[PDB]
Nucleic acid binder design. Structure first.
Ligand SMILES: [Zn+2]
Length: 190
DNA sequence: AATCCCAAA
């Protein structure tokens, strides 16, 4: 569908750090090109997707959202001569294995600056922290989604039918708590 | 300390 279901958005992008029940991953993405020394939004290079769930017919092994995203980039046929900025708004941050695959991609495509903005930090059974450091080392800009970024995704990716963004309880405090943990992860303190 | 986990009951 063209726009995300609002209940799906609200459920999946809730940023209570230790909340239960989020066993899917959603990813919104947008692309900019550097032109006349400023980033310009590519209107048709944006969208959203979810993970291919384990046991889904036609993909019984599943496919994480980040991988599904890297899968669409070649079809953009990005000019190998231009600089691009690709921003992903992820409900869960990348697992170790998908962090490594994203790090390989930006190592191989130096004309792409990747920004990952995540609602929640995915622990990956203690393995994600080193994955995120490795992704940052490769040049990705990783941050915790804030109020204005949730609102941006509501306004521009969600099928809101005119309804304004309604922040959930604790959004800012959750964002700030996650930002401290992300900094600790990226500084190798966690 | 552990919480939490692109599910599994
Ligand atoms: Zn993954």
């Amino acid at each position: 569908r063209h726009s995300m279901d609002p209940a799906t958005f609200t459920f999946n992008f809730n940023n209570e750090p230790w909340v239960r029940g989020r066993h899917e991953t959603y990813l919104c993405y947008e692309v900019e090109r550097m032109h006349n020394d400023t980033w310009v939004k590519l209107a048709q290079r944006r969208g959203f997707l979810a993970n291919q769930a384990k046991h889904k017919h036609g993909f019984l092994e599943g496919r994480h959202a980040a991988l599904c995203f890297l899968d669409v980039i070649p079809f953009w046929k990005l000019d190998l001569d231009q600089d691009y900025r690709v921003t992903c708004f992820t409900s869960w941050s990348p697992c170790f294995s998908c962090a490594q695959e994203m790090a390989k991609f930006i190592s191989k495509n130096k004309h792409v600056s990747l920004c990952i903005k995540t609602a929640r930090i995915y622990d990956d059974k203690g393995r994600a922290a080193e994955g995120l450091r490795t992704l940052a080392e490769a040049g990705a800009k990783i941050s915790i989604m804030t109020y204005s970024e949730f609102k941006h995704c509501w306004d521009t990716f969600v099928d809101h039918q005119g309804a304004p963004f309604q922040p959930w309880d604790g959004l800012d405090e959750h964002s700030q708590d996650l930002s401290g943990r992300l900094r600790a992860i990226l500084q190798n303190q966690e």
